[PDB]
C-alpha cells in the first residue's frame, strides 16, 4: 500500500492545491471515507521495552524492541502475539501464558497509563464501521522526526502526528483519502482526487508535502 500511497501523494502534490485560482476545499470533503482505525494514544518506552499504542476502538498493542508484537483486543482479555518471523497465536490474559507474563505486564502498564493520563485523538469521532471478520491492524513500524511521529499500520494506513500544534494526518491508500485533524481538533476527511480538483489551504498542502517525504522514508527503510 505504501507505493500506492506514494503515487497518490505525488498526484495531489503535483496539482499544487494551495495555488488553485479558487480553492474550494470543503467541496473535497467526504465523511464516508473516515477511517475504521487510527492511533488514539501512544507511549514511547523504546529505550528499554518498545512502543505502546491504543487504537480508536480502545484496543492496545505494543511493538517490542525484539521485533515481536502483542495486541490486546478491546474485550480486555483476548490477545494476539506475533513472533519475529510472523507467526501469530491467539491467547487470553486470564490463561496466564507463563513465557509471556513480562510482556503482558508491560502492555497492561502501558494500557493503564494511556487510559488514565492521555487524550484520545479523534475522541469526538465515530469510526467507520468495518467488517467484523477483518483482522485488527497492528503497528508495522514507526519513527519520530523533529516535527512528528509517523505510525504505519498493517492495514496500509499511515498517520503523522505533528508535535508543535497537535495537528494530525491519517492517510488511507485504499480509499485514496486523508483525514486531517486541525489545531482546534476539528476532523475533516477528504478524497485526494477531489483535493486535486478543488485545491486546499496552505496548511493542509504543506502537511501533504511533508507526508510524501515521510512515505518515501518508510519505503526507504522498509524491512
Amino acid at each position: 500500500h505504501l507505493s500506492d500511497m506514494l503515487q497518490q501523494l505525488h498526484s495531489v502534490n503535483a496539482s499544487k492545491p494551495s495555488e488553485r485560482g479558487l480553492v474550494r476545499q470543503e467541496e473535497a470533503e467526504d465523511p464516508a471515507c473516515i477511517p475504521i482505525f487510527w492511533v488514539s494514544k501512544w507511549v514511547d518506552y523504546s529505550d528499554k521495552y518498545g512502543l505502546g499504542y491504543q487504537l480508536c476502538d480502545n484496543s492496545v498493542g505494543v511493538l517490542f524492541n525484539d521485533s515481536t508484537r502483542l495486541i490486546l483486543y478491546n474485550d480486555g482479555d483476548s490477545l494476539q502475539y506475533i513472533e519475529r518471523d510472523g507467526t501469530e497465536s491467539y491467547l487470553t490474559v486470564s490463561s496466564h501464558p507463563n513465557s509471556l507474563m513480562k510482556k503482558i505486564t508491560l502492555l497492561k502498564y502501558f494500557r493503564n497509563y494511556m487510559s488514565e493520563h492521555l487524550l484520545k485523538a479523534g475522541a469526538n469521532i465515530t469510526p467507520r464501521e468495518g467488517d467484523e471478520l477483518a483482522r485488527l491492524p497492528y503497528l508495522r513500524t514507526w519513527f519520530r522526526t523533529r516535527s512528528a511521529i509517523i505510525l504505519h499500520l498493517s492495514n496500509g494506513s499511515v498517520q503523522i502526528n505533528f508535535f508543535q500544534d497537535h495537528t494530525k494526518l491519517i492517510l488511507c491508500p485504499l480509499m485514496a483519502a486523508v483525514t486531517y485533524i486541525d489545531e482546534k481538533r476539528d476532523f475533516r476527511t477528504y478524497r485526494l482526487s477531489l483535493l486535486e480538483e478543488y485545491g486546499c489551504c496552505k496548511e493542509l498542502a504543506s502537511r501533504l508535502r511533508y507526508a510524501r517525504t515521510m512515505v518515501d522514508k518508510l519505503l526507504s527503510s522498509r524491512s
Partner: peptide, 5 residues
Amino acid sequence: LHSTA
C-alpha cells in the same frame, strides 16, 4: 515520550 496528555 508519550502522546498529548
